[PDB]
Amino acid sequence: KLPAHGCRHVAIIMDGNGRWAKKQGKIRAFGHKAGAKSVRRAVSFAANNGIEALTLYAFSSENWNRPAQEVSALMELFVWALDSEVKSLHRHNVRLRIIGDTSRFNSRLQERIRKSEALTAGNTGLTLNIAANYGGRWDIVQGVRQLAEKVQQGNLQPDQIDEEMLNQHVCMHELAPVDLVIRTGGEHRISNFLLWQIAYAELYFTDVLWPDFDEQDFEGALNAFANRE
Amino acid sequence: KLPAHGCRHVAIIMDGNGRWAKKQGKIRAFGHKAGAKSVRRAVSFAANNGIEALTLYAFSSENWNRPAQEVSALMELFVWALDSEVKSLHRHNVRLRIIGDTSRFNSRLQERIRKSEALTAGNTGLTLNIAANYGGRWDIVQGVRQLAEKVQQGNLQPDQIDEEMLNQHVCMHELAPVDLVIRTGGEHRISNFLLWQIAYAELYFTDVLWPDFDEQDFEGALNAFANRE
Ligand SMILES: CC(C)=CCC/C(C)=C/CC/C(C)=C/CSP(=O)(O)OP(=O)(O)O
Ligand SMILES: CC(C)=CCC/C(C)=C/CC/C(C)=C/CSP(=O)(O)OP(=O)(O)O
Ligand SMILES: [Mg+2]
Ligand SMILES: [Mg+2]
């Protein structure tokens, strides 16, 4: 089963949860919880359609400025998702990775992440990347610091640093490159998501809100990609 | 006269010249020449509508693999544009900058670029950035090399490198951030253009081909931006 319409790595900006809840007179957190159901659905769709990697923008590094309470509810939802879906991810041969600066998360959450990555580390099917406390510029900077060290250590000359070398130091360099970025919610921006990695990616924007994003919507983005002529 | 709909810095991926010429039974070079007329028109529109900076993707660093003859014709068109439009740019108070690796261009062209930037260096109206032999990853790497040197020199510690610091070392860091990216030609990709810089930019894609892009088209992208809600 070759990647749906030949799409290897899909990345998604899951926006629109607040508006989806507000339209119904409910608070944003209600929308974030329904967004977790769309996550389940997108993950299943990707793993059943030969996609090699699915990368989800779950918590931008700029979301720390949102209402204290909304942030806490997000962190509890993350904990809850780890506790509740990891066994199924494992049974489905999905390898779980969290990308972003996890050092900023609480203990309980950091431990669950490390435990969930360990358990699925040897899985060979879909790789599911959850971008949490992630930013594209931060990602590039982490790689830059890694090369800066080598320079400090005398193991690398400034004139030796090139694109390929930094590329081997940004997140997900071990996976196929991002082929398609999908952003739900109607906004036409990348909002600091995978900047280095989306250099040659198709970009697909839909007004559909994340909680309503379903299998037909995902197939539509795949068809859009297949016709990327 | 405040930036059209409050848009300070517009960047454009001027695609579609080959298809525009082919539709008429003509060769790509014919389309590139007509694209130069659309450049004149976009520049005039930006300078007359309070835009602070207009950045045009004129020659990607990956276009070196195009047909030898098409590449040469592009280089002659660049030379020709410098020779022919610089006096008017100057009279219009436009500051000209070329971003990208100019060391790879021929002598005549390198000299004309340096001369044209010098003549307009003290202009204060629109800043026109022509991205020639430019790539977004290359741009970030040039900044990384600048910081790597400082590390080599013992003037900087790896742990001191952060986003703001690298930001002060990528192209156009002295100008307002890119607010809007327009890509003509129908493809929905960024194709290695301003990656670091487009983190928070609105992205506007149109099927209109670059040679046909006119003032009404540009106003439409501006209206799209104004309604970026
Ligand atoms: C289980 C798991 C790992 C993830 C699922 C939880 C979700 C959906 C996370 C993304 C939430 C954020 C910060 C969304 C942008 S929606 P928004 O709050 O910006 O909504 P809005 O733009 O106001 O309409
Ligand atoms: C005066 C000046 C500084 C610039 C104007 C010259 C132009 C229009 C330069 C951009 C040309 C390129 C490499 C365009 C993509 S069009 P394409 O050739 O990819 O066409 P296609 O995709 O095949 O339809
Ligand atoms: Mg949002
Ligand atoms: Mg093209």
Swiss-Prot record, chains A, B:
Provide the effect of W80F: Decrease in affinity for IPP
Annotated Gene3D superfamilies = Decaprenyl diphosphate synthase-like
Quote one Gene Ontology molecular function term: ditrans,polycis-undecaprenyl-diphosphate synthase [(2E,6E)-farnesyl-diphosphate specific] activity
Cofactors: Mg(2+)
Q: Where does isopentenyl diphosphate bind?
A: E202
Keyword Magnesium listed: yes
Q: Name one GO cellular component term.
A: cytoplasm
**How is the co-factor bound, per the entry?**
Binds 2 magnesium ions per subunit.
Which residues make up the annotated site Important for determining product length?
L126
Database matches in SUPFAM superfamilies? Undecaprenyl diphosphate synthase (SSF64005)
Instruction: Give UniProt keywords alphabetically.
Output: Cell cycle, Cell division, Cell shape, Cell wall biogenesis/degradation, Magnesium, Metal-binding, Peptidoglycan synthesis, Transferase
Swapping V94A leads to an effect described as:
Formation predominantly of C(60), C(65) and C(70) polymers rather than the C(55) polymer
Site described as Required for continued chain elongation, located at: A58
Q: Which residues bind Mg(2+)?
A: D15, H188, E202
Which residues does the annotation say bind substrate?
A: 15-20, 28, 32, 60-62, 64, 66, 183, 189-191
Catalytic residues in the record: D15, N63
Subunit structure of this entry?
Answer: Homodimer.
For this entry, the protein name equals Ditrans,polycis-undecaprenyl-diphosphate synthase ((2E,6E)-farnesyl-diphosphate specific)
Lineage, top ranks: Bacteria, Pseudomonadati, Pseudomonadota, Gammaproteobacteria, Enterobacterales
